[PDB]
Design an enzyme around this catalytic site. Structure first.
Site, PDB file in Angstrom:
ATOM      1  N   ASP A   1     -10.597 -56.185  -3.460  1.00  0.00           N
ATOM      2  CA  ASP A   1     -10.096 -56.702  -2.254  1.00  0.00           C
ATOM      3  C   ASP A   1     -11.055 -56.012  -1.028  1.00  0.00           C
ATOM      4  O   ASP A   1     -11.357 -55.013  -0.838  1.00  0.00           O
ATOM      5  CB  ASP A   1      -8.882 -55.721  -2.100  1.00  0.00           C
ATOM      6  CG  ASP A   1      -7.887 -55.906  -0.680  1.00  0.00           C
ATOM      7  OD1 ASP A   1      -7.987 -56.977  -0.165  1.00  0.00           O
ATOM      8  OD2 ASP A   1      -7.268 -54.958  -0.351  1.00  0.00           O
TER       9      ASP A   1
ATOM     10  N   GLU B   1       4.366 -57.760   1.199  1.00  0.00           N
ATOM     11  CA  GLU B   1       3.112 -57.945   1.080  1.00  0.00           C
ATOM     12  C   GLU B   1       2.794 -58.260  -0.367  1.00  0.00           C
ATOM     13  O   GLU B   1       2.612 -56.980  -0.960  1.00  0.00           O
ATOM     14  CB  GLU B   1       2.158 -57.044   1.869  1.00  0.00           C
ATOM     15  CG  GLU B   1       0.980 -57.385   1.783  1.00  0.00           C
ATOM     16  CD  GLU B   1      -0.098 -56.770   2.868  1.00  0.00           C
ATOM     17  OE1 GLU B   1       0.822 -55.963   3.850  1.00  0.00           O
ATOM     18  OE2 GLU B   1      -0.955 -56.563   2.707  1.00  0.00           O
TER      19      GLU B   1
ATOM     20  N   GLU C   1      -1.359 -61.893   2.891  1.00  0.00           N
ATOM     21  CA  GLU C   1      -2.775 -61.517   3.277  1.00  0.00           C
ATOM     22  C   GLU C   1      -3.706 -62.272   2.703  1.00  0.00           C
ATOM     23  O   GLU C   1      -3.957 -62.578   1.787  1.00  0.00           O
ATOM     24  CB  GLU C   1      -3.002 -59.827   2.809  1.00  0.00           C
ATOM     25  CG  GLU C   1      -4.249 -59.707   3.269  1.00  0.00           C
ATOM     26  CD  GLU C   1      -4.968 -58.176   2.863  1.00  0.00           C
ATOM     27  OE1 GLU C   1      -4.064 -57.315   3.292  1.00  0.00           O
ATOM     28  OE2 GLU C   1      -6.059 -57.939   2.356  1.00  0.00           O
TER      29      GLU C   1
ATOM     30  N   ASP D   1     -11.441 -56.936   2.075  1.00  0.00           N
ATOM     31  CA  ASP D   1     -10.903 -57.022   3.744  1.00  0.00           C
ATOM     32  C   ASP D   1     -11.975 -57.303   4.596  1.00  0.00           C
ATOM     33  O   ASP D   1     -12.206 -56.316   5.781  1.00  0.00           O
ATOM     34  CB  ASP D   1     -10.281 -55.577   3.787  1.00  0.00           C
ATOM     35  CG  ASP D   1      -8.782 -55.199   3.220  1.00  0.00           C
ATOM     36  OD1 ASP D   1      -8.558 -56.302   2.498  1.00  0.00           O
ATOM     37  OD2 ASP D   1      -8.246 -54.141   3.220  1.00  0.00           O
TER      38      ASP D   1
ATOM     39  N   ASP E   1      -1.179 -61.005   7.547  1.00  0.00           N
ATOM     40  CA  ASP E   1      -2.325 -60.109   7.510  1.00  0.00           C
ATOM     41  C   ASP E   1      -3.631 -61.109   7.534  1.00  0.00           C
ATOM     42  O   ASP E   1      -3.810 -61.787   6.468  1.00  0.00           O
ATOM     43  CB  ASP E   1      -2.437 -59.138   6.339  1.00  0.00           C
ATOM     44  CG  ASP E   1      -1.603 -58.055   6.774  1.00  0.00           C
ATOM     45  OD1 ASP E   1      -1.071 -57.798   7.728  1.00  0.00           O
ATOM     46  OD2 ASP E   1      -1.652 -57.008   5.720  1.00  0.00           O
TER      47      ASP E   1
ATOM     48  N   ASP F   1      -0.776 -42.530   8.545  1.00  0.00           N
ATOM     49  CA  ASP F   1      -1.924 -42.589   9.740  1.00  0.00           C
ATOM     50  C   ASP F   1      -1.367 -42.157  10.821  1.00  0.00           C
ATOM     51  O   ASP F   1      -2.367 -41.697  11.849  1.00  0.00           O
ATOM     52  CB  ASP F   1      -1.819 -44.414  10.087  1.00  0.00           C
ATOM     53  CG  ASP F   1      -2.410 -45.181   8.615  1.00  0.00           C
ATOM     54  OD1 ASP F   1      -2.816 -44.855   7.874  1.00  0.00           O
ATOM     55  OD2 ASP F   1      -2.017 -46.229   8.730  1.00  0.00           O
TER      56      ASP F   1
ATOM     57  N   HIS G   1       0.666 -47.004   9.111  1.00  0.00           N
ATOM     58  CA  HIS G   1       1.680 -46.278   8.054  1.00  0.00           C
ATOM     59  C   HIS G   1       2.182 -45.080   8.776  1.00  0.00           C
ATOM     60  O   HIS G   1       1.278 -44.558   9.503  1.00  0.00           O
ATOM     61  CB  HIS G   1       0.720 -46.048   6.750  1.00  0.00           C
ATOM     62  CG  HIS G   1       0.162 -47.212   6.007  1.00  0.00           C
ATOM     63  ND1 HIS G   1      -1.162 -47.897   6.539  1.00  0.00           N
ATOM     64  CD2 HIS G   1       0.419 -47.931   5.020  1.00  0.00           C
ATOM     65  CE1 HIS G   1      -1.237 -49.046   5.859  1.00  0.00           C
ATOM     66  NE2 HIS G   1      -0.290 -49.019   4.914  1.00  0.00           N
TER      67      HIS G   1
ATOM     68  N   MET H   1       4.952 -53.692  14.337  1.00  0.00           N
ATOM     69  CA  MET H   1       4.993 -53.490  12.787  1.00  0.00           C
ATOM     70  C   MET H   1       4.736 -52.388  12.385  1.00  0.00           C
ATOM     71  O   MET H   1       3.907 -51.574  12.938  1.00  0.00           O
ATOM     72  CB  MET H   1       4.060 -54.796  12.101  1.00  0.00           C
ATOM     73  CG  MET H   1       4.311 -54.355  10.538  1.00  0.00           C
ATOM     74  SD  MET H   1       3.448 -53.423   9.637  1.00  0.00           S
ATOM     75  CE  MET H   1       1.921 -54.319   9.513  1.00  0.00           C
TER      76      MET H   1
ATOM     77  N   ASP I   1      -5.873 -57.143   8.873  1.00  0.00           N
ATOM     78  CA  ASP I   1      -5.780 -55.980   8.060  1.00  0.00           C
ATOM     79  C   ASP I   1      -7.125 -55.995   7.473  1.00  0.00           C
ATOM     80  O   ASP I   1      -7.565 -56.688   6.354  1.00  0.00           O
ATOM     81  CB  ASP I   1      -4.740 -56.088   6.803  1.00  0.00           C
ATOM     82  CG  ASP I   1      -4.668 -54.981   5.936  1.00  0.00           C
ATOM     83  OD1 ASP I   1      -5.619 -54.060   6.079  1.00  0.00           O
ATOM     84  OD2 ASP I   1      -3.957 -54.855   4.939  1.00  0.00           O
TER      85      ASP I   1
ATOM     86  N   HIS J   1      -5.694 -61.487  -0.307  1.00  0.00           N
ATOM     87  CA  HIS J   1      -4.969 -61.066  -1.555  1.00  0.00           C
ATOM     88  C   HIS J   1      -4.595 -62.385  -2.249  1.00  0.00           C
ATOM     89  O   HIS J   1      -4.632 -62.586  -3.498  1.00  0.00           O
ATOM     90  CB  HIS J   1      -3.673 -60.116  -1.328  1.00  0.00           C
ATOM     91  CG  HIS J   1      -3.983 -58.823  -0.697  1.00  0.00           C
ATOM     92  ND1 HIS J   1      -2.857 -58.220  -0.162  1.00  0.00           N
ATOM     93  CD2 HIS J   1      -5.199 -58.176  -0.281  1.00  0.00           C
ATOM     94  CE1 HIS J   1      -3.571 -57.078   0.203  1.00  0.00           C
ATOM     95  NE2 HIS J   1      -4.937 -57.037   0.029  1.00  0.00           N
TER      96      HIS J   1
ATOM     97  N   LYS K   1       0.275 -58.542  -3.753  1.00  0.00           N
ATOM     98  CA  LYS K   1      -1.330 -58.531  -3.922  1.00  0.00           C
ATOM     99  C   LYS K   1      -1.153 -58.672  -5.710  1.00  0.00           C
ATOM    100  O   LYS K   1      -0.464 -57.998  -6.154  1.00  0.00           O
ATOM    101  CB  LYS K   1      -1.541 -57.068  -3.866  1.00  0.00           C
ATOM    102  CG  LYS K   1      -3.064 -57.000  -3.614  1.00  0.00           C
ATOM    103  CD  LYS K   1      -3.767 -55.846  -3.440  1.00  0.00           C
ATOM    104  CE  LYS K   1      -5.334 -55.645  -3.534  1.00  0.00           C
ATOM    105  NZ  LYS K   1      -5.967 -54.240  -3.178  1.00  0.00           N
TER     106      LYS K   1
HETATM  107 MN   LIG Z   1      -2.450 -55.941   4.398  1.00  0.00          MN
HETATM  108 MN   LIG Z   2      -6.555 -56.364   1.245  1.00  0.00          MN
END
Ligand SMILES: [Mn+2]
Ligand SMILES: [Mn+2]
Ligand SMILES: [Mg+2]
Ligand SMILES: [Mg+2]
Ligand SMILES: [Mg+2]
Ligand SMILES: [Mg+2]
Ligand SMILES: [Mn+2]
Ligand SMILES: [Mn+2]
Ligand SMILES: [Mn+2]
Ligand SMILES: [Mn+2]
Ligand SMILES: [Mn+2]
Ligand SMILES: [Mn+2]
Ligand code: NA
Ligand code: NA
Ligand code: NA
Ligand code: NA
Ligand code: NA
Ligand code: NA
Ligand code: NA
Ligand code: NA
Lengths: 387, 387, 387, 387
Positions: free
Chosen positions: C254, C180, C216, C256, C244, C56, C53, C87, C286, C219, C182
Site C-alpha cells: 500500500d 474500509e 480507498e 498511499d 479515501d 492520533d 483515529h 469522520m 488517505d 486498496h 483492504k
Molecule cells: Mn484509508
Molecule cells: Mn492505503
C-alpha cells in the site's frame, strides 16, 4: 495538431491493425486484411513503415510462386506509399508444431526446423531493407516444473542465437537481432521473462555485439516492473535496438492497448527518456485494436497511438525546458547524481574524514529531497495545467 | 525425522529470528534478542551458522570500545556452539540518512559515506570468516519519475561496486560479492529489480568474476516470476553465490514467510534444482516469524524452515530416482532437450532436407508431450502418494 | 489556478500529513506534528476538514485530564480555522494487543476491549460533529490457513457491528458506519478484502441502513481491480458513505501516494463518476508524503492532492459537455445501455420474433462499437489536447 | 489408491477435456471431441457427471432436427454410463454478436437475444435434470472508461437476472442460478469481478433466494485473493450453490490448470473447508489440459484433478482428526473465536470493567498465538511427514 511526420519513424506490425479479434474465448470479429490495404491505410495516417512475421506476409505452406507473388504485391504497396520495412520477425508460436517451443522445443527435429524457418525469413528481411530482426520466444517455457530443464533450454537458446549470428556474419548482412522478453502467456512461464534476463543472456553469446533487446511496454508491466527503468538499463548497456509501444492496465493477460492507454504517466516518462537519450530507432506499435471495433475503429486506434506519442513528446519537452523545472531538478540534486562519487579514487576516499568520522549524518538526514514538488511540476506539464 | 545436520549448511540472519515485529502499521510485539541468545538457540535447532548486517551486531554509532565488546561476545557464542558466519552485509536502508539511497543517493556525500560504512564492515566480515558479502540496495530507486535518472544511478552503482572490488583486491581478501535483487518495497521501484537485471549489471563491472547474485524466493515472486527458473539462469551463468530462502503468498508486500510456506510447489522445484545442480553454498533463511508469535513460535518457525527443506529434499530425490519418473522424462524428451541442436554445424543444418523440405510438420505436431503425466508423478512424489 | 474552496470538501487524516516516515525497513524521517499545527497548515492550503483515529488525537493510555486537554487544544484549532471533522475512526491495529485482530481476534477478551475502545471514540466523534465513523479492520485476517476460521470470524465481525449499531441507536446518534476494505497488508489476507465483500457483509447486518463502505483507491488497486467500477457498484447500492483518495502504482504494498499519482486515467474516471453522480460526501485523502520529504514537501504533497482533483474535475466536465463527445457516446450506444431491456415484460419478450427467430446476428455482429474514438476524445480532454 | 467413487460427485465441463488448444497466439492442437466420447471416457475414469454450454452440445445455428439428434445421442451416452448432468450454462461470449456483452451489451437488441438464448437452454437443462444454471458474464465489462456506464450496466444485469427468475418461477422449475465471477479476461475489467461483488449484487435481486455463486479457484487468484476465504464468505451467506475447481499459478491470464496444480496449499485449505462444512454440491472441474498434450494426456490430466482432490481430502481429514492438532487449535484459541463476544449483551459489556478499565493490555499482548506450530502440523499432514 499533433500530426505525424516521416522523421517520427512510427511503424506498425501487419498483425496489429490486421488482428481479426480472436481471443481465448471468442471468434474473429473482423475479416482478414490484405497487407496491401494495411500499408496504404497506415501511410494515409502518417506512418513511416510496417513490420511483419513471415506468416503475416506469406501464408504458411505457400509454394515458391505464391511466395513471390505475395512479396511482389507487398513491395508495390511499399513503393506506392514510400513506406519502409525496418524490422521483421519469425512466427515460431502459432503452428501446432511449436507447442513446446521453437529454439527450445524438447524435440530436436523441431529446434532444427525453427532455425531453418528463421533463416529463410532473415534472407527476406534483408531483401526488404530491414535493419533489425526480432525474436519473441513466446512458446519457450513451461506450465510445469519437470517439463523443461532451464539450464538445458538456455544452452539450446544460446546455440540457436549463435548459429543465427554465424549465418548473418557469413552472408555479410548488416542486420542485428533484438530479443523480445515476456514473462508469461502463452506459456505459464516464458524463458528470458524480462529485459534484465534478456540482457544477461546476450552477454553469454559468442558475438554479443550482434544482439540487443526489443522491450514491449505491456510485457514489463505484466511483471509489475517499471518500463522506463528497464529501458534506461537497456540504453545504459547500449542494447536498445528496437522498442514495442502499447498500453497495459495492470498485471493480467497481455492487453496490447493502444499506446498512451494503460499507464499514462509511465508513457510520459518513457517518451521523456527516449527523446532525452536521442533514441534513433523506430517508434513501433505492437498493439491490437479491441475486437469491439470495426475497421474505422482500427484506423482510429492506430492514429491514436501516434497522436499520444506526439502529445507526450510535447509535454515532456516543455517539462525539461521550463526554468522552474530546471531549478527543481537542482533542488532535488539530480545534478549531483550525475557526478562521480569518487573520481579522487579509492585511497582518497578512505583517507577522507568528511566521508566518515566527520560526516554529520543527522544534518544530512534532515535535508528534504523536494521530490513531491518536482513530481507535481511534472504532472502539471503532462496535463497542461501550469499556473 | 528430518533432523538438520552440519552438512546441510542451514544459516539464518540475526535479523530473522531477531525481528521484533514492527510492521507498517504496528509496534514491536517482541523484545530485542541478544545475538548471543540467537546463536545458542539456532545451534540447538541444528543450524550451521548465522549472518548479520553491521547494525545487527554493533548498534549504530557505537564507540570503538563498544564495538570490540559486541564482537567479542558474539565470537564467544560462535566458539561455544561451533556456529559459522558465512555471509555478512551492510545496513544501507534503516537510518534516515539513506532515505534516497546509499550507493545511488542523489547526494554525493551520502554515497561516499555509504561506501565507507560498507568497507568497514567488509573488514569485519573477513575477520569473522565470511566468504560472501551481500548487497541489498533496498533504498536504491524512486517513487516518482523525475527523482532518479536511472542511467546516472547505474553509473553510480557501477562506480560503487567497482571501488569495492578494488578494495578487496588491494587487501588480498578472498571474499566475493552477491547482489540481492528486489522489485519494490521500500521504494516504489527498486533498481536491479530481478535476478536478470542484476546478472546483466554484473557483466558491466570492471572485475565481473568478483560478483554474483543472492536471489530471494519472495522477491522474485513479488514480480510474479518463476523462482526456480531464475535460479537456473543464475546457475547457468555461474553466478549463484548465495541464496535467501523464504515463502511468499503471491504478489503483495514482502512477507518473508518461513521456507515451504507460500508457493509449496515452487519450493519443491527449487530444492530439486539446488540438489541436482550440486549447489554448495549456504541454505540461508531470510524470513520473519510473524508478529503474532512469542519466542516459542520464533524457534518453531526457524525449525520449520529447515524441516521443510529436508522434506522437500527427500521427495525430490525420490522423484528423480524413480524408474517410472525416468521413463516419463524420456517420454517427454527431456533427454533430447539436453542434446545439441546442430553439433553438425551451420552448413550441415542448411543442407539438411530433414530440417525443412522433408520435415513432416503435421506428424511432429501430432506428438503429445506427456507433460501432464510427468507432473502428476511429481505431485504424487511431493505428497508421498505414490500408488 | 485550481484553488480549493470550502464547497470542495477536501479533508485529510491527521495521520497523513503527520506520518513520520517509519516503513518496514526504515526509521522515522520527520518529527511528530502537533495536531494543532496540521489543522492550521491544512486550512492555509484550502482544506475543509480533518479526520482522526482516537490515538492520533489522544496518546494511547492518556489520563482523563490529559484527554480533555488534547481535545480542548484541537477544538481551539478547529475554531481558529473553521475546519470541520466529518469522520473519525478507531486505531485497532497499532498496539501489540491487536496483533491477531480487534473485532475478530481469536481471544474473546481482546474482542470485548476492541468494542469498548471503539464505543469510547464514537462518543468523541459525535461531540466533534462527525457524520461518519470508519472501520478499517487491518488486523482482521491471517498468514496461515489454520489460524482463522473465516465463518466464525464473520460471525464475530457481524456481532461487533451489530452491537455498535445497537449502541448508536440507543444513544440517538445520527452517525453512520463505513467499512474500509483492504485485501492484504499488514495481514497476509484481510477479511472483507474488497468493496464487493464489504457490501455483501453489510446486507447481513441487523440494521443494514446504518452501514456503508469507505473504499480507498489504492486498496482496490492492490487486488488489480478497477476502482471506478467498484465505486459505481457502491453508488448503485446506495452505500458510498465516504471515500479515501490516493494513488497506487500497481499491485504491491500500500503506497498511499498523493491523489493523481499512480493510475492517472483511473483518477480521471473516478472524478468523472463522483461528479456525475453528485457524490456529496467529503473528498478525503488517505495518503502519505514520502519519507524523502521534509515538511515543505509534506505541504506540497497535500496541496497536490487537491490540485489534481480540481484539474481532473475540470477536464471531466469539459469531456461530458463537449458536443463531439455527446455524439460519440450516442455512436457507442451509451444511451441504449441506460434504457430497459424489456419494459414490455417477460411474456412480450418470449413472443418477440425480433429477439430470436428474426434477429440477424451477423448484421448485429458487424456493427462497430466506436469505443476507440470515444476513448481518444477522453484522452484528448484529460491532456488538454483537443485539436 | 485414491480411486473416485460416485459419492465423490466429480463433474467436468464438456469444454474442459474437449478444449482443442486454441490460445491467444496459437492454433488448435487437438481435434474436436464428440460429447459422446467425452462422456464415455470420463465415466471410465470414475467421474459422476458432465456439464455443458448450449453451444458445446448443439452447434450454434442448428436446425430443430439437428438439435434433437445431438441431444438424443448425448442422452444415450448418459444412459449407457450412468453419468449425470447437474449443471448447464449459456455461451454468451464466443459469437461476435456478444463482443460488448450479452445481458449488458450497450445494444438493446443484443441484450434481448441473450435472454432468449439463455431461456431456451434453461428449458434443456431442466429436461436433462440439472439443478443449477451457471452464468459467467465473460463479455460484461470494458477496456475503456467511457464505453460502459457501470450503474446502468448493473441495472441491465439486475433486469436480466430478475426476468430469468420470473421465467423459472412461472414454469415451476426447481433449478437455481449461480453467478460465476471473474476479474478480467477477455474484457479489460469484468463486471462482478469477485465472489464478494457477486454476493452483494444478488442481495438486490427481486428473488434473492434463487441465486448463488459459482466461484472458480483461478478467478479469485487472478485478483490475488484467498480462495478459501471467499468460499467461507459464500458458505456463511448460504450461497455456495456450485464450485469450479482448477489451478492458477499467480496473477496472470486464466490458466485453468488441473486441480491441485498452482497453489497447492490453497487447494488443501479449500478441500478442508468444503469437507468440514459438508458442502454437498458437485466437485466440478473447469480446467484445460495444456495444448502440449495428446488425448492420452487429456485423460491423464482429468484423472489427476480427481486424484489430487482425494489426496487432499485424506490429508485434511487426518489433520483435523489428529489429537495433537486439536490441542494446537486450542492453544491458538480457535475454540474461543467460535464463541460469542458478548452474549451478555451491550449493557453488560458497557458495564464490564474487565473489558476496559481493568483489562491488562500488556499481559494480553504478551500471549503468543502459536500459529506457526499449528501451520507446521498442517504442512506435515499435507506432505505425510508426521514424525
Ligand atoms: Mn484509508
Ligand atoms: Mn492505503
Ligand atoms: Mg546527463
Ligand atoms: Mg543434464
Ligand atoms: Mg443516466
Ligand atoms: Mg464450529
Ligand atoms: Mn504484448
Ligand atoms: Mn511485441
Ligand atoms: Mn524479503
Ligand atoms: Mn534477503
Ligand atoms: Mn478460468
Ligand atoms: Mn468456470
Ligand atoms: Na544442455
Ligand atoms: Na542503446
Ligand atoms: Na552519470
Ligand atoms: Na553458480
Ligand atoms: Na461462530
Ligand atoms: Na451512495
Ligand atoms: Na439504467
Ligand atoms: Na452454501
Amino acid at each position: 495538431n499533433y500530426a505525424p511526420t516521416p522523421v517520427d519513424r512510427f511503424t506498425f506490425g501487419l498483425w496489429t491493425v490486421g488482428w481479426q479479434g480472436r481471443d481465448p474465448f471468442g471468434d474473429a470479429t473482423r475479416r482478414a486484411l490484405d497487407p496491401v490495404e494495411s500499408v496504404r491505410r497506415l501511410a494515409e495516417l502518417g506512418a513511416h513503415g510496417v513490420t511483419f512475421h513471415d506468416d503475416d506476409l506469406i501464408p504458411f505452406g505457400s509454394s515458391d510462386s505464391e511466395r513471390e507473388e505475395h512479396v511482389k504485391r507487398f513491395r508495390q504497396a511499399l513503393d506506392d506509399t514510400g513506406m519502409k520495412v525496418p524490422m521483421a520477425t519469425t512466427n515460431l508460436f502459432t503452428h501446432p508444431v511449436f507447442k513446446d517451443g521453437g529454439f527450445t522445443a524438447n524435440d530436436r527435429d523441431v529446434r532444427r526446423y525453427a532455425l531453418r524457418k528463421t533463416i529463410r525469413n532473415i534472407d527476406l528481411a534483408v531483401e526488404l531493407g530491414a535493419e533489425t530482426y526480432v525474436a519473441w520466444g513466446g512458446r519457450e517455457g513451461a506450465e510445469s516444473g519437470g517439463a523443461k530443464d532451464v539450464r538445458d533450454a538456455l544452452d539450446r537458446m544460446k546455440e540457436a542465437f549463435d548459429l543465427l549470428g554465424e549465418y548473418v556474419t557469413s552472408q555479410g548482412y548488416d542486420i542485428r537481432f533484438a530479443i523480445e522478453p515476456k514473462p508469461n502467456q502463452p506459456r505459464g512461464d516464458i524463458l528470458l521473462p524480462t529485459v534484465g534476463h534478456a540482457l544477461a543472456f546476450i552477454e553469454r553469446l559468442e558475438r554479443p555485439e550482434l544482439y540487443g533487446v526489443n522491450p514491449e511496454v505491456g510485457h514489463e508491466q505484466m511483471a509489475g516492473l517499471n518500463f522506463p527503468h528497464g529501458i534506461a538499463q537497456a540504453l545504459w548497456a547500449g542494447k536498445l535496438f528496437h522498442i514495442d509501444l502499447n498500453g497495459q492496465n495492470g498485471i493480467k493477460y497481455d492487453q496490447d492497448l493502444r499506446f498512451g492507454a494503460g499507464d499514462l504517466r509511465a508513457a510520459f516518462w518513457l517518451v521523456d527518456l527516449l527523446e532525452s537519450a536521442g533514441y534513433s530507432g523506430p517508434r513501433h506499435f505492437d498493439f491490437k485494436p479491441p475486437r469491439t471495433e470495426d475497421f474505422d475503429g482500427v484506423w482510429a486506434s492506430a492514429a491514436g497511438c501516434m497522436r499520444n506519442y506526439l502529445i507526450l513528446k510535447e509535454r515532456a519537452a516543455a517539462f525539461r525546458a521550463d526554468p522552474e523545472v530546471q531549478e527543481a531538478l537542482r533542488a532535488s540534486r539530480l545534478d549531483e547524481l550525475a557526478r562521480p562519487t569518487a573520481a579522487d579514487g579509492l585511497q582518497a576516499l578512505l583517507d577522507d574524514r568528511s566521508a566518515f568520522e566527520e560526516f554529520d549524518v543527522d544534518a544530512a538526514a534532515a535535508r528534504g529531497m523536494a521530490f513531491e514538488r518536482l513530481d507535481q511540476l511534472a504532472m502539471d506539464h503532462l496535463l497542461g495545467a501550469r499556473g
